[PDB]
Design an enzyme around this catalytic site. Sequence first.
Site, PDB file in Angstrom:
ATOM      1  N   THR A  28      -4.770   5.450  -2.060  1.00 36.87           N
ATOM      2  CA  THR A  28      -3.563   6.160  -1.650  1.00 36.87           C
ATOM      3  C   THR A  28      -2.540   6.232  -2.777  1.00 36.87           C
ATOM      4  O   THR A  28      -1.940   7.288  -3.011  1.00 36.87           O
ATOM      5  CB  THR A  28      -2.958   5.488  -0.421  1.00 36.87           C
ATOM      6  OG1 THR A  28      -3.787   5.746   0.717  1.00 36.87           O
ATOM      7  CG2 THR A  28      -1.579   6.034  -0.154  1.00 36.87           C
ATOM      8  N   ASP A  76       0.822  -1.256   0.000  1.00 39.07           N
ATOM      9  CA  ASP A  76       0.000   0.000   0.000  1.00 39.07           C
ATOM     10  C   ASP A  76       0.834   1.274   0.000  1.00 39.07           C
ATOM     11  O   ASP A  76       1.820   1.335   0.690  1.00 39.07           O
ATOM     12  CB  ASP A  76      -1.103   0.036   1.051  1.00 39.07           C
ATOM     13  CG  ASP A  76      -0.658   0.127   2.481  1.00 39.07           C
ATOM     14  OD1 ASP A  76      -1.380   0.776   3.264  1.00 39.07           O
ATOM     15  OD2 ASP A  76       0.380  -0.462   2.793  1.00 39.07           O
TER      16      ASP A  76
HETATM   17  N1  LIG Z   1     -11.849  -6.220 -11.308  1.00 39.79           N
HETATM   18  C1  LIG Z   1     -11.021  -5.224 -11.699  1.00 39.79           C
HETATM   19  N2  LIG Z   1     -10.620  -5.113 -12.983  1.00 39.79           N
HETATM   20  C2  LIG Z   1      -9.797  -4.130 -13.383  1.00 39.79           C
HETATM   21  N3  LIG Z   1      -9.309  -3.188 -12.558  1.00 39.79           N
HETATM   22  C3  LIG Z   1      -9.631  -3.178 -11.244  1.00 39.79           C
HETATM   23  C4  LIG Z   1     -10.525  -4.223 -10.732  1.00 39.79           C
HETATM   24  N4  LIG Z   1     -10.677  -3.988  -9.418  1.00 39.79           N
HETATM   25  C5  LIG Z   1      -9.944  -2.888  -9.113  1.00 39.79           C
HETATM   26  N5  LIG Z   1      -9.320  -2.407 -10.201  1.00 39.79           N
HETATM   27  C6  LIG Z   1      -8.438  -1.219 -10.230  1.00 39.79           C
HETATM   28  O1  LIG Z   1      -7.347  -1.423  -9.338  1.00 39.79           O
HETATM   29  C7  LIG Z   1      -7.057  -0.227  -8.620  1.00 39.79           C
HETATM   30  C8  LIG Z   1      -6.748  -0.575  -7.172  1.00 39.79           C
HETATM   31  O2  LIG Z   1      -5.561   0.091  -6.758  1.00 39.79           O
HETATM   32  P1  LIG Z   1      -5.029  -0.104  -5.258  1.00 39.79           P
HETATM   33  O3  LIG Z   1      -3.755  -0.910  -5.277  1.00 39.79           O
HETATM   34  O4  LIG Z   1      -6.200  -0.541  -4.416  1.00 39.79           O
HETATM   35  O5  LIG Z   1      -4.676   1.412  -4.871  1.00 39.79           O
HETATM   36  P2  LIG Z   1      -4.955   1.948  -3.384  1.00 39.79           P
HETATM   37  O6  LIG Z   1      -4.306   0.921  -2.490  1.00 39.79           O
HETATM   38  O7  LIG Z   1      -4.294   3.301  -3.354  1.00 39.79           O
HETATM   39  O8  LIG Z   1      -6.460   1.993  -3.313  1.00 39.79           O
HETATM   40  C9  LIG Z   1      -8.267   0.681  -8.748  1.00 39.79           C
HETATM   41  O9  LIG Z   1      -7.854   1.951  -9.252  1.00 39.79           O
HETATM   42  C10 LIG Z   1      -9.181   0.014  -9.752  1.00 39.79           C
HETATM   43  O10 LIG Z   1      -9.404   0.898 -10.849  1.00 39.79           O
END
Ligand SMILES: Nc1ncnc2c1ncn2[C@@H]1O[C@H](COP(=O)(O)OP(=O)(O)O)[C@@H](O)[C@H]1O
Lengths: 46, 528, 521
Positions: free
Chosen positions: C91, C58
């Site tokens: 984040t 994260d």
């Molecule tokens: N099923 C999915 N298919 C494609 N993209 C996804 C899916 N689920 C989540 N995402 C993408 O993955 C990202 C998650 O990033 P993440 O590592 O959670 O960042 P943070 O930890 O800052 O929230 C989101 O921006 C979302 O757009």
Amino acid sequence: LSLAPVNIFKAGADEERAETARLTSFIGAIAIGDLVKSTLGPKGMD
Amino acid sequence: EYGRPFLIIKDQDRKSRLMGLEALKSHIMAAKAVANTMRTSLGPNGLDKMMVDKDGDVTVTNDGATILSMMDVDHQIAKLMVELSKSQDDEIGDGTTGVVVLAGALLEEAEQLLDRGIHPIRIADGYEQAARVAIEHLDKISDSVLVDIKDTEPLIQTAKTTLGSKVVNSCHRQMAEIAVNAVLTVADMERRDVDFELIKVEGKVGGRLEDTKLIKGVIVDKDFSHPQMPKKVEDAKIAILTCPFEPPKPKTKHKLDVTSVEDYKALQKYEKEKFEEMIQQIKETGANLAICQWGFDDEANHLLLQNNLPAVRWVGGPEIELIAIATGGRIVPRFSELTAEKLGFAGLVQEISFGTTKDKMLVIEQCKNSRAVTIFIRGGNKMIIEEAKRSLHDALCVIRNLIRDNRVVYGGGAAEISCALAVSQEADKCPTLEQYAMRAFADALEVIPMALSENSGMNPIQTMTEVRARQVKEMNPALGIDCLHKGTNDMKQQHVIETLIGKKQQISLATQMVRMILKIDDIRKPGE
Amino acid sequence: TPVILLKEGTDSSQGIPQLVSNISACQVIAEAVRTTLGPRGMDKLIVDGRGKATISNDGATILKLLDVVHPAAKTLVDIAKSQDAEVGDGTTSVTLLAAEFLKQVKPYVEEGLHPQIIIRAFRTATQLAVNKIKEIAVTVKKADKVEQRKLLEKCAMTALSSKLISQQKAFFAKMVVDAVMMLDDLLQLKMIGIKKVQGGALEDSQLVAGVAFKKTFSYAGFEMQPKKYHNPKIALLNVELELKAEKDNAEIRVHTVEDYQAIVDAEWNILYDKLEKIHHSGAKVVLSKLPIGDVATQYFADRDMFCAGRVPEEDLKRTMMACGGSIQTSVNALSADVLGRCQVFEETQIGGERYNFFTGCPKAKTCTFILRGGAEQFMEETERSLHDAIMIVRRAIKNDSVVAGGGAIEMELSKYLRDYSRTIPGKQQLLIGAYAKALEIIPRQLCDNAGFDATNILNKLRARHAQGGTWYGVDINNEDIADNFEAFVWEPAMVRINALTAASEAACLIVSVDETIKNPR
Ligand SMILES: Nc1ncnc2c1ncn2[C@@H]1O[C@H](COP(=O)(O)OP(=O)(O)O)[C@@H](O)[C@H]1O
Ligand SMILES: Nc1ncnc2c1ncn2[C@@H]1O[C@H](COP(=O)(O)OP(=O)(O)O)[C@@H](O)[C@H]1O
Ligand SMILES: [Mg+2]
Ligand SMILES: [Mg+2]
């Protein structure tokens, strides 16, 4: 060429594998029984 | 603008970083060195490791948990394998050198897949699907027999195999009867649990290894207070006491004022009546032996002797509650509360003597139904006692698992050959770039048979091939590796039994560690 | 020259080279957390000076573990802590967005553009993008109990798909939703019992409907009392039930030996008076922050009553809102309305540890999570991943508004700003147009982490949006684009609104700085 390219142990720690560990354990034990052998029997020294 | 080397991180010039694939290859090479040290210490024909403590001490052991514990490593991935084995011993107790071998062999098989252009998350996704096929297959070949008190024998044969590997094999039939008999005594049958505080393991050096026995009471390392007390008794009622034999003293800041001569003479009389009042209260209730946590006095020591009432001085905290459970008595904090219904019952209280030393021990046995037992380990060496204690703890932990779950499977490599065929057969119907990950799982699963054959002295690929060919042709999933040279590869006849939950954890726990390693790509550490 | 103004060592820089060297300093912070985005992201490993490893995916904890000393780059670390304090998710999406707003305007700074023109343009685009999200945010009518449970399951499943527990996101998303409806109004974060027990498997984690705390220190006789009750009565106390002095500031001055013996019997009668009052009340389980002596332990062993002591404050307060008692500092008033009650109480063994359970509370308003892993860093990464679905659902109750994800909302905003820029003339075209080209960094990183063709896919997304598919995102399993709203990839509208405001404020602050002065020591 050395004991694996990566470093697992710390600095100052040693390891012995099969062919050299048997060498240490066998010369260590014989040395103990050689110093003591001279004091065996009715005519042992001091 | 001349982008000179501007400073971003503190101590930037003393820090290193690995990224991309080269960081992933360093993890595998670090986990291949650790898992290849523990390969030789596997199976009945394994060999153990010498360990030298930091200060001056020497430890000889075959257990996989303690070997990785006293080995000091600096690689971070090597510290993850140490915790992988430690989380297995406290949960089950057997199989702690089998998990690191499988996890190390599970990472090596993924090295070829990465080199072909395969995303690491795809590998860590196909591995979990295989672990769901092997676990669901392990329940299909599992056999549950029974667990009770009247027919005990399958329990004995379960603890016989785990003891087969350790140094205690000359007398391993006797040490398989102590482990089974000391578990069904202290274990409840409704709540299905075992309290290991109720089992005391005490070893005393000197003597013989086969002199180890199970005592159905409590053995405390202490002796009688006065040298002229009788060493043995035949009918003793145990009077457990917590309070000392000194005259009372309040905790608040008391001060006693003496302003005359009659106040002084009334104080000497007070002291001597308090001693005589104590012995009268113990003798009145019918007590025969006194047990005290704190010390006696010069005057309270003779009164016990003069009244034919032996006593034991300065016993420990935890030992007191074991005598209360064993003898069936109760603990009183004062003399006023000492009644006839708060007394224990022993059948024999002796004072055993060792050889030409001044070590005396008090033993307590010949009691009624008990919930506390002790194990007395003997032996002629310092390192024999310590390893004997570790081997017995493994035997007790195996029986404890059978109380929760009766069903068992057959070892000697039989479970791995059967599990590797179910995974490989199901991988033929998965065309999504997962057959490669599934096939790699079933190939690392067969390293266990190839580690037993190599240690035994046989050819791995020549014996392992003949076992699978016999298992597919027939319908017998209980064929393993003949490590002891008995003639038959049938494990059911040779009485090799392994607990089911022991094998389930060695697959479910080993897979999840591989998911961390395959997920990690960057390292940032200071330079030395 | 002989007399100098500032101290010897005051380093100072200014001008065009001063500002361009700051844009190139945020490119290093954004690249440290670039590869932890999406379902195929990879976590990092950081080591402290002592040797403790912290393995995490994260952004917020990665940027906290780097000893960044650059004054310009320290703005990007401060906005990450703001995002994990307001919404708790997104984040690492405000770190790439903050650096992409500076890379796209880097060439215009070199050409001699007044940076005040840039700041006016950045503020105009943010207000036009935040208002577009609220206009097309999907909401529901009469959110009934069933439809209000499915909505939060989908949101909690999406925040978990990019973390270490990605195979078991279905099992965990059912426990988080049930763990927040037990709370009532304030949804305090201290009413959830995250506990970590070594050993086991990831599918062996359980959620209890009460409280559970580790076995504390016990004296002699603790093994002589029962460890399973049917309908006990919990007596939550704050007292030392041990033989001690009444007051530290006290003194006794007795004259005769007859009064000496009565004093010794007075301390044994004070203690026995408290224990009798507890036993008469019908209580069966007693707890206390202050220690419990061995005399009190053997008192409760002879009456089939359980005792405990040295309980932490965080665990007694969790019991109170699960059983329904109150902390008593005195035993002079133990009525029926100041006692607890439950349905089962026992002391089992999990992973070589003794734990006490208080399940069976129909009026419970708190829960407790027992996490089973295989290493110290396996449990910490599981606890941090659970802390993201907790705050997502907590924010999703106060705001029942959701939008599609996977780049589906970054691309609709970039289409709206490109159309707006072609109407207004002047130098605002090259600034708003540079704002719209920077919003497609999120879809590009999703195709770079998985290993896709980041250019051909983006050409297809830009064509599906200009035709008029509003929620058309990307797909990682199908090697193509798809409808992410029908694919159940949902996220609250508050994670993108706060992401643009934080990213725009951090970019506008760095641009305005003209010169820096570092003083010695
Ligand atoms: N099923 C999915 N298919 C494609 N993209 C996804 C899916 N689920 C989540 N995402 C993408 O993955 C990202 C998650 O990033 P993440 O590592 O959670 O960042 P943070 O930890 O800052 O929230 C989101 O921006 C979302 O757009
Ligand atoms: N008599 C036997 N014949 C064949 N295999 C055995 C026998 N006894 C034990 N084994 C095998 O040895 C393996 C390793 O057990 P062991 O060497 O005791 O260490 P651990 O039990 O800690 O892994 C087990 O998988 C078991 O199947
Ligand atoms: Mg074994
Ligand atoms: Mg997230």
